Amino acid sequence: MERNKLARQIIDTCLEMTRLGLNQGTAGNVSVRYQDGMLITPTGIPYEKLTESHIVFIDGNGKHEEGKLPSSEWRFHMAAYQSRPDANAVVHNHAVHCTAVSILNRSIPAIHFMIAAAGGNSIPCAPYATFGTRELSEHVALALKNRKATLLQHHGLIACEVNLEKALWLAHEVEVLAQLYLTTLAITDPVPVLSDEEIAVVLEKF
Amino acid sequence: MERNKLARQIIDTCLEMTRLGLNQGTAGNVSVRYQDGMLITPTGIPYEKLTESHIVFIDGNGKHEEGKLPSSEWRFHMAAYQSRPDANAVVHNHAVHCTAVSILNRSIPAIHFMIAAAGGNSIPCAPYATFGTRELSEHVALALKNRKATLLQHHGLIACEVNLEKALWLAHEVEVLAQLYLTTLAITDPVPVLSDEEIAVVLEKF
Amino acid sequence: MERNKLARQIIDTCLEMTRLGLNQGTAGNVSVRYQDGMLITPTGIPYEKLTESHIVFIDGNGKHEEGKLPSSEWRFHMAAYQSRPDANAVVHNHAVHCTAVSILNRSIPAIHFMIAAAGGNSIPCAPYATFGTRELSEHVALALKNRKATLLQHHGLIACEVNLEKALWLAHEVEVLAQLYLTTLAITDPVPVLSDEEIAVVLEKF
Amino acid sequence: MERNKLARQIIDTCLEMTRLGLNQGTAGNVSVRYQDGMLITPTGIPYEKLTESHIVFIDGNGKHEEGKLPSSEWRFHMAAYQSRPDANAVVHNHAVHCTAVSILNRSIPAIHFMIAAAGGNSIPCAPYATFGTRELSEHVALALKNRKATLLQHHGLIACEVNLEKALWLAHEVEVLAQLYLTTLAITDPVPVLSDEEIAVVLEKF
Ligand SMILES: [Zn+2]
Ligand SMILES: [Zn+2]
Ligand SMILES: [Zn+2]
Ligand SMILES: [Zn+2]
Numbered sequence: 001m002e003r004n005k006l007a008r009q010i011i012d013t014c015l016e017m018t019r020l021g022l023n024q025g026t027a028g029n030v031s032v033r034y035q036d037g038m039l040i041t042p043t044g045i046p047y048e049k050l051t052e053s054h055i056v057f058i059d060g061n062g063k064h065e066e067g068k069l070p071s072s073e074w075r076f077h078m079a080a081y082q083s084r085p086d087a088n089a090v091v092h093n094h095a096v097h098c099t100a101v102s103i104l105n106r107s108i109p110a111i112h113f114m115i116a117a118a119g120g121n122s123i124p125c126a127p128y129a130t131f132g133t134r135e136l137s138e139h140v141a142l143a144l145k146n147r148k149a150t151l152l153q154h155h156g157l158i159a160c161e162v163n164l165e166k167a168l169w170l171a172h173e174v175e176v177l178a179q180l181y182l183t184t185l186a187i188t189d190p191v192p193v194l195s196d197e198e199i200a201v202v203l204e205k206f
Numbered sequence: 207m208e209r210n211k212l213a214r215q216i217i218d219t220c221l222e223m224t225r226l227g228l229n230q231g232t233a234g235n236v237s238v239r240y241q242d243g244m245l246i247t248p249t250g251i252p253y254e255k256l257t258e259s260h261i262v263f264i265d266g267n268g269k270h271e272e273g274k275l276p277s278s279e280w281r282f283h284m285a286a287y288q289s290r291p292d293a294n295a296v297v298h299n300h301a302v303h304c305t306a307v308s309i310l311n312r313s314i315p316a317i318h319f320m321i322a323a324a325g326g327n328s329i330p331c332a333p334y335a336t337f338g339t340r341e342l343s344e345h346v347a348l349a350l351k352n353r354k355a356t357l358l359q360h361h362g363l364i365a366c367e368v369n370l371e372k373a374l375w376l377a378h379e380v381e382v383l384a385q386l387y388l389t390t391l392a393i394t395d396p397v398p399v400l401s402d403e404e405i406a407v408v409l410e411k412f
Numbered sequence: 413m414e415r416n417k418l419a420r421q422i423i424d425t426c427l428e429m430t431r432l433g434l435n436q437g438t439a440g441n442v443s444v445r446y447q448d449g450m451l452i453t454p455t456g457i458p459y460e461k462l463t464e465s466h467i468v469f470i471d472g473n474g475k476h477e478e479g480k481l482p483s484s485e486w487r488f489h490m491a492a493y494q495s496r497p498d499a500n501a502v503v504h505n506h507a508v509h510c511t512a513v514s515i516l517n518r519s520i521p522a523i524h525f526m527i528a529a530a531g532g533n534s535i536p537c538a539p540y541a542t543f544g545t546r547e548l549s550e551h552v553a554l555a556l557k558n559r560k561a562t563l564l565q566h567h568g569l570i571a572c573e574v575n576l577e578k579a580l581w582l583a584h585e586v587e588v589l590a591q592l593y594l595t596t597l598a599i600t601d602p603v604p605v606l607s608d609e610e611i612a613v614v615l616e617k618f
Numbered sequence: 619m620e621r622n623k624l625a626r627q628i629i630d631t632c633l634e635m636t637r638l639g640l641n642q643g644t645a646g647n648v649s650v651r652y653q654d655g656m657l658i659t660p661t662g663i664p665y666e667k668l669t670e671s672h673i674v675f676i677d678g679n680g681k682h683e684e685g686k687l688p689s690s691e692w693r694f695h696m697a698a699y700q701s702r703p704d705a706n707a708v709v710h711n712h713a714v715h716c717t718a719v720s721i722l723n724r725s726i727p728a729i730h731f732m733i734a735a736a737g738g739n740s741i742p743c744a745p746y747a748t749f750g751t752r753e754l755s756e757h758v759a760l761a762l763k764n765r766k767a768t769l770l771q772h773h774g775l776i777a778c779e780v781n782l783e784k785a786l787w788l789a790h791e792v793e794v795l796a797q798l799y800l801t802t803l804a805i806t807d808p809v810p811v812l813s814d815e816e817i818a819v820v821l822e823k824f
Binding site for chain 3: 226317318319320375378379382385386389390392393394397398400404407408411
């Protein structure tokens with residue numbers, strides 16, 4: 001539970017996201033809850049040139065470490081932590097299927113029972129606002145009130161969970177649900193869904 | 207034909223499924239026929255942290271080993287074994303193309319002659335029922351009466367065969383047929399099929 | 413130009429086809445022109461368990477080596493060699509995009525100038541006939557009269573060239589053209605094409 | 619800033635392009651600004667057989683080194699350098715999504731805010747002209763006047779930037795935008811876009 005271990009895990013999560021096809025280029029950012037704020041990836045540096053010392057600490061007031069530049073999207077990581085006290089890790093990426101659904105501005109409905117992993121019968125899509133702004137942060141905090149993941153219109157995905165391993169797992173599951181949704185929407189609209197009654201049973205079972 | 211070899215093979219099949227793109231996250235479960243019951247993967251543990259000792263024995267009465275938690279979908283593995291005496295291995299996964307077809311609730315018709323690998327002129331789609339229930343098990347046992355693989359509505363795929371190698375091979379072939387089906391359904395509906403007469407010739411040749 | 417080198421190359425081509433995503437399971441078969449007949453992969457054996465001694469010699473009369481079982485599709489390899497004297501290697505696979513186009517029973521028209529690599533302004537699609545039959549062989553020999561590659565209705569692809577390296581390269585290029593065709597056909601039908609006059613210029617330049 | 623280092627980087631960029639799924643077969647060509655002309659990949663040689671000595675120097679007059687054959691598409695690399703003085707590296711490939719959009723002859727509109735990486739609110743599509751001709755070069759020089767990347771009708775993509783690392787990164791980002799565009803166009807046409815006012819804010823922020 002010390003900084004160098006948590007930074008190591010952040011880096012490993014970045015690399016694994018790229019392995020899984022969820023992150024291309026420099027698009028993702030990952031953070032963990034730490035002391036009074038968080039540890040987050042820096043802006044600009046390619047994932048594969050990332051060393052432990054590159055990880056940035058931002059306190060609870062938004063002041064970041066001396067000599068480092070945090071991800072340009074750090075504000076919605078801090079909004080996630082303040083909106084969901086149980087969240088200890090946040091994964092953000094621009095995964096292609098999730099992002100295509102965000103362009104249509106649709107929520108993902110209950111086309112598969114694994115949608116319950118995010119907390120309910122849907123994956124919401126928060127309205128567009130310029131990256132890095134307060135307005136974006138507010139939409140995100142509202143979307144995560146009762147869901148562990150949300151799409152961001154014309155942008156990508158945010159997933160949060162109790163640790164990095166589970167946050168990555170959820171993010172990967174939402175990209176699969178997005179891919180299922182787009183593949184079936186091309187054939188039929190609307191796509192068959194499971195009823196609220198059936199999702200209620202699955203949620204209890206989880 | 208001893209437990210440690212069979213457990214080793216189960217684990218290798220899990221890893222290979224992930225290699226092939228058939229399994230994401232923690233979704234699949236694999237089993238083999240053993241003594242009076244079966245050996246199956248455990249619930250929860252990520253595939254890459256799986257060791258031989260993690261594999262769970264469930265007898266013919268449904269009693270599982272002390273100190274282990276079997277896959278939460280073990281009941282339809284036991285239903286497969288009871289419905290098909292010739293089956294010695296069962297692979298279950300949530301492969302994306304198969305699962306998208308299961309959302310449409312369609313059987314895969316004979317769009318390619320390799321559909322005969324599963325025993326007939328189609329890959330059926332068994333109706334939805336909550337995972338882990340007796341109701342689900344019954345649909346699966348009925349769908350496998352005359353087929354070696356079946357889709358499961360809003361869920362995924364089950365394939366069974368004489369050994370793990372062949373069961374994985376079949377599962378991969380059904381995911382390819384599913385992908386062929388979705389790709390052509392987006393262009394034309396209905397999709398051209400081979401006649402029953404032609405499938406009858408291919409079945410004899412196999 | 414001895415047997416063990418050519419067998420080594422066949423095996424390497426099988427492995428590389430799988431690397432490229434052109435071959436799944438046990439579907440492909442590869443051959444090279446040799447002495448009075450050909451060297452071809454065997455039936456059944458998985459690509460990764462293939463050793464030099466597994467490669468099968470079939471003479472010009474169709475008699476195969478003692479103790480080995482040649483690919484079950486060897487007849488259309490022999491038809492390719494007899495129809496195209498310049499062909500020294502044949503690659504056959506069930507690549508997913510090519511096969512989806514073969515299900516629609518469409519030729520691939522000149523949607524990109526690389527279609528000229530196969531010899532003209534199209535990739536034909538030969539009519540369906542049961543695998544391994546004389547009827548299939550005849551369609552293939554007719555389709556390859558003026559083209560180096562052909563789709564096979566409800567089945568897959570055959571590509572031939574002066575050596576294995578070029579035959580694999582062509583097969584991969586046709587799978588890309590197939591993918592381009594399906595992706596654009598989902599959006600608009602018919603798909604824009606280059607005129608015959610423009611393909612004529614590209615053919616001269618190659 | 620010597621030739622052997624720059625050639626090494628060109629080769630590494632070729633290999634990485636193939637790693638990323640942007641380049642299949644022998645289709646791409648990469649160059650860097652050097653002395654009075656450029657260093658470019660040769661024609662024909664497969665990427666994996668490329669050694670430092672294979673890289674070709676072409677001066678500012680179009681004269682290439684003795685004993686080497688430059689890429690057959692070198693003219694539009696030289697046109698890019700003359701049209702954009704700030705460009706120091708050029709990546710060209712036939713990436714499948716970009717190329718499918720080029721077949722439709724559509725520009726990619728602002729469906730995601732990362733479109734601003736190429737300089738504006740769109741990725742243009744330059745009209746078709748035979749590869750290697752002066753006519754093609756002219757369309758490319760006009761398309762790159764106010765954009766760092768362009769699609770080429772019925773052909774592929776060109777991206778330019780201050781160094782190879784950034785040029786590859788841009789090329790990969792445009793392939794993602796192309797994939798986003800095709801995936802959403804199959805569902806709805808036209809696809810929702812961000813307004814010019816919103817792209818103007820994102821451009822300032824970058
Ligand atoms: Zn973002
Ligand atoms: Zn399941
Ligand atoms: Zn075949
Ligand atoms: Zn080109």
